[PDB]
Design an enzyme around this catalytic site. Sequence first.
Site, PDB file in Angstrom:
ATOM      1  N   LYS A   9     -64.523  38.493 -16.401  1.00 49.92           N
ATOM      2  CA  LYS A   9     -64.162  39.901 -16.389  1.00 49.92           C
ATOM      3  C   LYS A   9     -62.701  40.075 -15.980  1.00 49.92           C
ATOM      4  CE  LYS A   9     -64.548  42.787 -13.194  1.00 49.92           C
ATOM      5  NZ  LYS A   9     -63.255  42.627 -12.476  1.00 49.92           N
ATOM      6  N   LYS A  14     -57.980  36.105 -14.076  1.00 48.44           N
ATOM      7  CA  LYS A  14     -58.442  35.056 -14.979  1.00 48.44           C
ATOM      8  C   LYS A  14     -57.299  34.514 -15.830  1.00 48.44           C
ATOM      9  CE  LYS A  14     -60.367  35.302 -19.330  1.00 48.44           C
ATOM     10  NZ  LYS A  14     -59.498  36.483 -19.569  1.00 48.44           N
ATOM     11  N   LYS A  40     -55.737  43.283 -24.055  1.00 48.43           N
ATOM     12  CA  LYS A  40     -54.482  43.491 -23.341  1.00 48.43           C
ATOM     13  C   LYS A  40     -53.395  42.541 -23.827  1.00 48.43           C
ATOM     14  CE  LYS A  40     -51.799  45.195 -20.129  1.00 48.43           C
ATOM     15  NZ  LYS A  40     -51.408  46.626 -20.044  1.00 48.43           N
ATOM     16  N   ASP A 126     -65.511  41.178 -19.736  1.00 49.33           N
ATOM     17  CA  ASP A 126     -65.909  42.458 -19.156  1.00 49.33           C
ATOM     18  C   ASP A 126     -67.205  42.957 -19.782  1.00 49.33           C
ATOM     19  OD1 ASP A 126     -64.587  43.590 -16.966  1.00 49.33           O
ATOM     20  OD2 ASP A 126     -62.800  44.044 -18.154  1.00 49.33           O
TER      21      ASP A 126
END
Lengths: 271, 271
Positions: A9, A14, A40, A126
């Site tokens: 997530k 990460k 992103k 996520d």
Amino acid sequence: MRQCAIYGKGGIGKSTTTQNLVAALAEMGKKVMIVGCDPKADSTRLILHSKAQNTIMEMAAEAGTVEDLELEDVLKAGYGGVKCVESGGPEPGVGCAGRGVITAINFLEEEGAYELDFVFYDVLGDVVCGGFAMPIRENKAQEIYIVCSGEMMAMYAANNISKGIVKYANSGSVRLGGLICNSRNTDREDELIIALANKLGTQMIHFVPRDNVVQRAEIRRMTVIEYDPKAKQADEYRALARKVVDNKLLVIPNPITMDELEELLMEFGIM
Amino acid sequence: MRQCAIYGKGGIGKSTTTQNLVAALAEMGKKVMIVGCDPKADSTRLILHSKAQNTIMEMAAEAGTVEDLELEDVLKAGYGGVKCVESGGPEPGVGCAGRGVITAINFLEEEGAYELDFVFYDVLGDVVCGGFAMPIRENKAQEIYIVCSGEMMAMYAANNISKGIVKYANSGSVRLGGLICNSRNTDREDELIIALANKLGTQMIHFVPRDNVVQRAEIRRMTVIEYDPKAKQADEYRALARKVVDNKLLVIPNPITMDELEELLMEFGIM
Ligand code: SF4
């Protein structure tokens, strides 16, 4: 060549852990490619020292189609010779993350980018849906490593990723290699993640501590390995890289129920 | 009947704010129905005083198909007569999170559960894809309220949801009715969210502060409106509810770029 996917997530570091691990691998002489499958598109900033790498989706939009695209603009070499490519997020509210990821992977395979010791897909965890499980479903990544933390959302995402793996671990060769615990300075976080991995049947491959040098390198758009090679966090990332290289425990996980997860958190003092 | 969707990234207490807003609405005499569109399905726990409400996908799996389901087991009434539905998350790694919402909304339409002063779809805005934007695309939600915070990821999610609203607003009638700021005790967070709303062409409809009574009520699986009616946070939720009722400024947003959002964070001391 080993096809590995780092799942997890967002908001738990990460991408930074993935980039530092890849930098440590490159420092060991391994030819690594990073494919960012995150909307992103932040999975290659530290390797490339770039504010934002042009993703495959944006350059395809500027050029019409991926068919009229060039690998030179798509794929960029960063620190240690690491090749970097961003799949590109979906059009907000219109497209699928999965279609962008599969388009990027197909373009890379057609252009011959895969022809390397490691290919790491930095995939968002996520939500664990069909689109974000494209590398697992289409047999693109064989070893899955989950970056998690000692919080409810992180372990819930890890369990959902394990469920997806279990779904595709039959009639498929995708396996769980381990769990990477990105520390959040929470007490008994390593013990909690070790217990979660034991419940899942996997291992906690490495516990990544919190260090200020990580943020110091991230301000410079750099990894800890490049910024301060003699830092302790650099040694932590090198240990993680060595344990990933020497990883042989690739298992089909056993996802736990929600009650078991809450019981784990109660046992280790989180809720 | 007013059709609204509360969008927003996870981890910022969007679901808690939505449930408290709906409780304050029902406390004023409005008949509200909550449709939970998050895969983790926590959008109706505080209203129903339940550990986890049984979602539509789970009952469909247990009963074979949705056509063998009844509204009694699907639609549950909680505090203040609020009717609660959980759409059901996708099967991890296989389904699309936006088709469970399609199935839930279609089933509720056949069952006649939409014939009510407010319908609120709690939709997760971590990734703004074609699936998670179903209520906007399918014209099921007409007023979108984005719950955000001073953190970077919340503002990025708000901008992406605004992009989706822009895409589906020139053809449909979906509009953005404002931004709800879920405080994280960050300095100049209200000012930053007001500036973001002004850049988007919308308003910060309410600033929801951080209060311990929210957590005390959530421990008891209830909203602050039911737990402590005479609390200050209950008054804040009542103010938000009456501002939502009296809301007439429904706009087509102007999403801001990466540089504008970064400069917004720099101005108010977050980046
Ligand atoms: S499969 Fe997942 S990423 Fe694709 S549209 Fe559905 S929810 Fe979004």
